[PDB]
Amino acid sequence: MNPPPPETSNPNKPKRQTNQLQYLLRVVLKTLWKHQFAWPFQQPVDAVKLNLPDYYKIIKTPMDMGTIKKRLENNYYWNAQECIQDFNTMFTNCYIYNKPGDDIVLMAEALEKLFLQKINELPTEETEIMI
Amino acid sequence: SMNPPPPETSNPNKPKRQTNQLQYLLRVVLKTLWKHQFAWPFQQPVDAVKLNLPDYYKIIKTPMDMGTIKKRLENNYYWNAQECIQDFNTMFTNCYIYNKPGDDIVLMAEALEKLFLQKINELPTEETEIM
Numbered sequence: 182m183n184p185p186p187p188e189t190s191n192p193n194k195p196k197r198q199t200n201q202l203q204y205l206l207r208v209v210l211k212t213l214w215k216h217q218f219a220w221p222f223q224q225p226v227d228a229v230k231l232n233l234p235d236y237y238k239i240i241k242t243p244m245d246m247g248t249i250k251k252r253l254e255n256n257y258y259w260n261a262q263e264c265i266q267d268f269n270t271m272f273t274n275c276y277i278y279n280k281p282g283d284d285i286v287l288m289a290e291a292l293e294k295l296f297l298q299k300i301n302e303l304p305t306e307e308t309e310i311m312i
Numbered sequence: 313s314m315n316p317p318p319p320e321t322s323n324p325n326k327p328k329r330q331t332n333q334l335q336y337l338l339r340v341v342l343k344t345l346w347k348h349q350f351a352w353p354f355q356q357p358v359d360a361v362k363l364n365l366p367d368y369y370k371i372i373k374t375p376m377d378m379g380t381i382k383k384r385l386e387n388n389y390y391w392n393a394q395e396c397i398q399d400f401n402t403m404f405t406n407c408y409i410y411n412k413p414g415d416d417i418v419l420m421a422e423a424l425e426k427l428f429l430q431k432i433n434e435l436p437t438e439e440t441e442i443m
């Protein structure tokens with residue numbers, strides 16, 4: 182069965198906005214979201230609809246771009262690294278559950294390569310921006 | 313790279329009609345299939361653009377899906393139940409034509425088709441017109 186989706190807010194988690202996080206939403210997320218291979222990653226894995234009864238036994242930290250997008254929009258993150266970590270979790274979850282050469286893995290790899298290209302242009306200094 | 317217009321779901325020039333088994337196909341068959349775990353790929357037309365399938369509509373010239381069937385039933389588009397049963401069969405057949413025997417989507421379609429056959433075996437025995 183599917184767990185609830187990852188939180189996109191938390192009253193106990195400090196919120197923040199930075200120049201780097203703005204970039205992650207406006208440039209990085211936007212570019213990946215519109216990519217040909219984006220669709221399977223735009224919402225949580227539905228293990229019932231995909232008949233993957235072991236998915237959430239193997240994947241203990243699920244993540245998807247819909248969640249990341251909403252976290253950025255909601256100022257859920259404290260810094261850019263927290264967001265970058267979520268992207269990395271999304272990619273590695275796919276590699277962990279699946280096998281090399283699988284179509285979905287090839288898709289994840291292409292998105293990850295694009296991701297790395299785009300964050301190479303991340304502003305080098307973190308500047309906090311008042312919400 | 314481009315999707316075709318969806319199948320027709322209503323037409324003034326067409327004689328609108330309703331029967332008891334057509335009502336059953338909507339209220340029982342369509343309803344039950346829609347809620348199946350593997351209904352999702354069949355709930356709307358195949359989106360060849362999103363799925364990157366430039367050959368899908370080269371191969372499939374009579375596409376059909378449950379979203380279209382739902383609309384046809386609602387709009388009283390069919391003349392009788394056999395016209396509707398034919399659309400379900402076309403939907404399944406398209407999947408088996410485009411994909412390979414061991415493919416995940418084919419296994420999904422086969423499970424959905426098994427349920428379809430079970431439900432239509434309980435169709436009202438005599439087709440009677442409803443005004």
Ligand SMILES: Cc1sc2c(c1C)C(c1ccc(Cl)cc1)=N[C@@H](CC(=O)NCCCCCCCCCCNC(=O)C[C@@H]1N=C(c3ccc(Cl)cc3)c3c(sc(C)c3C)-n3c(C)nnc31)c1nnc(C)n1-2
Binds near residue numbers: 231275354358359
């Ligand atoms: C909305 C529709 S309509 C429709 C389709 C879809 C998605 C499908 C289809 C439907 C369901 C599935 Cl499981 C696979 C394909 N195939 C096309 C034909 C097609 O696209 N052929 C191209 C080759 C497809 C190769 C499919 C390999 C399937 C492997 C299944 C086992 N592995 C998994 O379930 C892991 C899962 N794997 C996938 C995945 C695998 C391959 C591809 Cl190309 C995309 C996503 C996946 C997600 S989330 C999510 C919503 C999906 C479909 N994912 C993430 C994230 N991480 N792992 C995954 C088709 N033909 N007739 C109909 C109807 N369809």
